[PDB]
């Protein structure tokens, strides 16, 4: 139907949006801390500690296959990076400081984000 295409040009213009977004998040991790997710191999436990793991590269694959179906629940993938990683690793490490300042960082693109969608519908 014509009803069907305006929701799929929709969802492709949410897409391309959060594709934006998900780049300036991501440009404020420059360590590349959360560009992937956590190693098994090298970290063999860490699902008896995490039971959502999340990371940049599996909300791009997502996001490609337009499975965010609005901005909160790509907001709940990029909460659950940072919340992982605070609990995960303690405060005194380089893992939990970037962390705090991806979520600091990240809270001003999401501001805007949210509006912009808001704004355009």
Known sequence: ??????????????????????DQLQDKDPARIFAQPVSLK?????????KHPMDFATMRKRLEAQGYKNLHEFEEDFDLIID?????????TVFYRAAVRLRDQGGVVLRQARREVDSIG
């Open 1 to 22: 139907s014509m009803e069907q295409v305006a929701m799929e040009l929709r969802l492709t213009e949410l897409t391309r949006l959060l594709r934006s977004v998900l």
């Open 84 to 92: 992982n990683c605070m609990k995960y690793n303690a405060r005194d």
């Open 42 to 50: 090298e970290v063999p436990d860490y699902l008896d500690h995490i």
